[PDB]
Design a protein around this ligand. Structure first.
Ligand SMILES: [Zn+2]
Lengths: 57, 79, 48, 49, 44
């Protein structure tokens, strides 16, 4: 779920702002190749104070 | 009676919105959050707070508190 | 003897889920699957 | 005397590296495990600041 | 806005869950029933 450069290592700025370039290597790319990235962030198990995991365990 | 006794017990006790909720996935892009909730049967098992209660109170106060604490992280990122 | 025993450090940056870490009192020597880890401990102790 | 330096700083200072090597060293696994792949993003932007 | 840094969202919502209460009398919680034929309710 990340976006790096390929020439240098500089982590490119988010495509949302404008076109894609590394601040050091200044390589340019097609912004629409990698647009619409999918991010599905979940929460680890056994982190909420339960009421029912008693009967659910 | 004993049934009404346990009813008052579950009443005066406070449920915390965490104790009802399952895993909370947040799909990103915009910004999108989804909260799982268990079936009404187990819901009234532990409880006896009604669905419309969830709806109204959840929406309003959950909204407000989420707003405030995300403003907190924003203001800390400002620092 | 470690690198002779099937565990090799990745010069190319690579890492997987199953693999764990091996360290010689503060030095990354390589990485290993945990069952191999226990077998390495066993053979090393027997050699000792 | 106490002293307090950010880890990304010292990590880039140590080796002439690519930030991709940094990430794949941190969360080399199971590509894009949500927790670590978000926290490392946040740290990386924060040091890029 | 896009300029805002990434946020630890799942933890934020997990806290907000615990940080909202539906029917809480201000300053009470945890009511329990314990065994004398004079039945009484413990309240924290
Ligand atoms: Zn670059």
């Amino acid at each position: 779920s990340l976006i790096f450069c390929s020439e240098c290592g500089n982590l490119l700025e988010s495509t949302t702002a404008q076109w894609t370039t590394c601040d050091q290597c200044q390589s340019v790319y097609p912004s629409e190749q990698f647009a619409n990235l999918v991010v599905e962030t979940k929460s680890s198990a056994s982190a909420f104070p339960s009421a029912l995991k008693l009967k659910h365990s | 009676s004993d049934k009404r006794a346990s009813a008052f017990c579950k009443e005066v006790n406070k449920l915390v919105l965490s104790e009802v909720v399952r895993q909370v996935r947040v799909t990103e892009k915009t910004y999108a959050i989804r909260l799982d909730l268990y079936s009404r049967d187990e819901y009234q098992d532990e409880y006896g707070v009604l669905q419309e209660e969830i709806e109204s109170t959840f929406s309003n106060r959950f909204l407000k508190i989420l707003n405030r604490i995300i403003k907190s992280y924003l203001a800390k990122s400002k620092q | 003897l470690l690198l002779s025993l099937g565990v090799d450090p990745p010069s190319v940056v690579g890492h997987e889920s199953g693999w764990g870490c091996v360290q010689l009192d503060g030095k990354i020597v390589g990485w290993c699957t945990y069952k191999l880890a226990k077998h390495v401990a066993d053979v090393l102790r027997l050699m000792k | 005397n106490e002293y307090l330096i950010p880890s990304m700083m010292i990590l880039k200072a140590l080796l002439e590296t690519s930030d991709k090597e940094i990430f794949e060293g941190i969360v080399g696994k199971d590509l894009g495990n949500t927790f670590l792949t978000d926290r490392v993003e946040l740290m990386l932007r924060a040091y890029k600041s | 806005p896009i300029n805002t840094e990434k946020l630890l969202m799942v933890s934020l919502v997990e806290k907000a869950c615990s940080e909202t209460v539906i029917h809480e009398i201000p300053g009470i919680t945890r009511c329990f029933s314990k065994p004398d034929t004079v039945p009484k309710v413990i309240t924290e």
